[PDB]
Design a protein around this ligand. Structure first.
Ligand SMILES: *[C@@H]1O[C@H](CO)[C@@H](O[C@@H]2O[C@H](CO)[C@@H](O)[C@H](O)[C@H]2NC(C)=O)[C@H](O)[C@H]1NC(C)=O
Ligand SMILES: *[C@@H]1O[C@H](CO)[C@@H](O)[C@H](O)[C@H]1NC(C)=O
Ligand SMILES: *[C@@H]1O[C@H](CO)[C@@H](O)[C@H](O)[C@H]1NC(C)=O
Lengths: 428, 186
């Protein structure tokens, strides 16, 4: 539905997902995984660096195998200025055309500032035995560099004034928070985008943790046989992120500090650490697809009416104003059916998983074209019992459909004369 | 032309799974799944997409989707894997009383357990291993020989089945058997 008004529970579910992440990480080696960038070595440099305050970090604080360049993390990223160009087209993943991916990568995710982690030298991290702290250094580096890039490129690809509007400041804080959450799914092997760079990037990660499990084994280790999990080192990578997540976010606050908005979705700039990383990745991209879609519809709609203002306020039926309005009403329709084609695969994949959790019982695990079935249906299953909707045949819960999810937790305000993702002057 | 989601599934016997067949054609002639498993179609407004609730899957199953796209009938299949803990795990009937020095043989029976690829059995004395081998045949027969020494007078002997679903995403499940304490005399 889109009667009574239903509660907002996105923060309540990731909170339980945060409680479970902590409790099982404390069962294993959470404390022996806490790190700070000040305790690592970079460039095989043993000289004192001033990484107490992580804001003081620079590009030289990196185990990049190249680092002959000036660009450290954002090297070869968005050479066409389309990362935050409003209304840019989304892409599909690459893997073998088996169980075709409904994963639509956001534009900020494709041009993510990660060139340092992609060309990482695994030696300089594990040659010393401080691989934990030497790893958080490069993670906080890409985190702080990308926060500087996102706030910068969004203000250029959309040409924002000095008094930035509060809806745009909220749109950036969410974009930064979406970037912080994507990073956590990279470390844990939860990332959906399978590119030639990501596979090599994940190849360095597996090697690094393989030394980290043996690093804190100084005897009995709580990660017995973790190499034979999918993703590899599943438990160890999940625990490592929980230990240092408050610091990866503290790294980005060094760049979010200059945004003058402190309420709403920028509530996490100064206070606290956000819970977006414990919300599944397919959902965070669904709301981001909804945002850039509503930003795209508002543009095409205002362009349409500037050409067709004549034809409904006097244009005759064959003049320039009708052919001008003919192309405008065909170009506007050409764009929406482009995007709704993506929304069709999204809404149908969302429906497959929500109902999958009602009939599948304890001990059901999936593996296919995408890794994230097993984590997705478990989120809904815990969600379906918090809302109480597990009988197959109930529609009270608005989370029954994909559009109903964006109605509750999404933040799409800018769609004009059409706020509908749900349904159940052009011809002069 | 035809797709299926999900692709590889591991579920406990007696449960349910939801499989979806979809085609690139948006008005295909026919669309359905072919499996001997009890299905129950769930009515959705999709005309190029049909979903089925397969109930009480007891063994391995490989259903296939068929959709009638004007370009030629297309097919796509899924692979279901069933798992369950072994039913009977038991040691060979042996007397509690043994004299010193005798050669003792111990067999452990493993009835069931699936999938046998990820199922191994261990023969233990207290919490020390003696032999560790996968489970083959039903009942899976595994044996080892121990010489009777009287310093283990009253020590517990047991075997344990051990199936791990860690690589596929689940937990490892294990079963201990009845303990046999030998009484050494002489
Ligand atoms: C073999 O072990 C499995 C667990 O690996 C047993 O199934 C569990 O039984 C326990 C009781 O010990 C229950 O608490 C669990 O809920 C059961 N788990 C599941 C997933 O079924 C099984 O009963 C054991 N078999 C024998 C013959 O003892
Ligand atoms: C059993 O585990 C092995 C890992 O040694 C794996 O290769 C195999 O696929 C598993 N068996 C299955 C999934 O049936
Ligand atoms: C099993 O071993 C323990 C060793 O501490 C012993 O106390 C017990 O008597 C043994 N036998 C049993 C429990 O039948």
């Amino acid at each position: 539905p889109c009667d009574t008004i239903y509660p907002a529970i996105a923060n309540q579910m990731a909170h339980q997902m945060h409680e479970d992440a902590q409790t099982e990480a404390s069962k294993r080696g959470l404390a022996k995984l806490r790190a700070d960038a000040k305790q690592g070595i970079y460039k095989k440099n043993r000289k004192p660096q001033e990484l107490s305050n992580i804001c003081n970090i620079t590009l030289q604080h990196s185990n990049d195998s190249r680092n002959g360049n000036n660009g450290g993390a954002c090297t070869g990223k968005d050479g066409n200025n389309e990362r935050f160009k409003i209304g840019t087209e989304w892409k599909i993943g690459e893997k073998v055309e088996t169980t075709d991916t409904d994963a639509y990568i956001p534009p900020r995710r494709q041009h993510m500032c990660t060139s340092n982690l992609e060309n990482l030298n695994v030696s300089w991290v594990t040659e010393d035995g401080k691989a934990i702290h030497s790893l958080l250094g490069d993670v906080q580096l890409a985190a702080k560099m990308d926060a500087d890039e996102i706030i910068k490129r969004y203000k250029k690809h959309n040409t924002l004034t000095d008094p930035i509007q509060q809806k745009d400041q909220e749109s950036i804080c969410r974009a930064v928070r979406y970037s912080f959450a994507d990073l956590g799914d990279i470390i844990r092997g939860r990332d959906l985008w399978e590119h030639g760079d990501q596979t090599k990037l994940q190849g360095h990660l597996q090697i690094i943790f393989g030394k980290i499990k043996e690093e804190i084994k100084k005897g009995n280790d709580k990660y017995k046989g973790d190499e034979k999990n999918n993703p590899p080192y599943k438990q160890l990578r999940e625990d490592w992120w929980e230990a240092n997540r408050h610091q990866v976010w503290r790294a980005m606050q060094c760049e979010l500090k200059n945004l003058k908005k402190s309420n709403g979705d920028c509530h996490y700039n100064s206070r606290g650490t956000p819970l977006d990383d414990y919300i599944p990745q397919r959902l965070r991209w669904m709301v981001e697809w909804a945002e850039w879609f509503c930003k795209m519809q508002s543009q095409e709609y205002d362009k349409l009416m500037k050409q067709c203002s004549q034809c409904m306020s006097d244009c005759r039926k064959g003049d320039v104003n009708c052919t001008s309005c003919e192309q405008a009403c065909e170009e506007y329709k050409k764009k929406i059916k482009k995007w709704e084609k993506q929304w069709n695969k999204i809404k149908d994949k969302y429906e497959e998983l929500y109902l999958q959790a009602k009939i599948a019982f304890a001990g059901t695990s999936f593996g296919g074209g995408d890794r994230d079935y097993q984590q997705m249906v478990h989120f809904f299953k815990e969600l379906q019992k918090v809302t109480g909707d597990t009988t197959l045949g109930d529609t009270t819960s608005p989370y029954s459909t994909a559009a109903g999810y964006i109605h509750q937790e999404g933040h799409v305000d800018e769609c004009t004369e059409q706020t509908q993702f749900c349904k159940n002057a052009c011809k002069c | 032309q035809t797709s299926v989601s999900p692709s590889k599934v591991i579920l406990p016997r007696g449960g349910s799974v939801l499989v979806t067949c979809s085609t690139s054609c948006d008005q295909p002639k026919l669309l359905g799944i072919e499996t001997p498993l009890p299905k129950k179609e769930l009515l959705l407004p999709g005309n190029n997409r049909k979903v089925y609730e397969l109930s009480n899957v007891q063994e391995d199953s490989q259903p296939m989707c068929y959709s009638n796209c004007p370009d030629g009938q297309s097919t796509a299949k899924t692979f279901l894997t069933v798992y369950w803990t072994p039913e009977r795990v038991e040691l060979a009937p042996l007397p509690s009383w043994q004299p010193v020095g005798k050669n003792l043989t111990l067999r452990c029976q493993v009835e069931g357990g699936a999938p046998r690829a990820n199922l191994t059995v261990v023969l233990l004395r207290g919490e020390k291993e003696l032999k560790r081998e996968p489970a083959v045949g039903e009942p899976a027969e595994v044996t080892t020989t121990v010489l009777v020494r009287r310093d283990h007078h009253g020590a517990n002997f047991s075997c344990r089945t051990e199936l791990d679903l860690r690589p596929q995403g689940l937990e490892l499940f294990e079963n201990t058997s009845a303990p046999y304490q030998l009484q050494t005399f002489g």
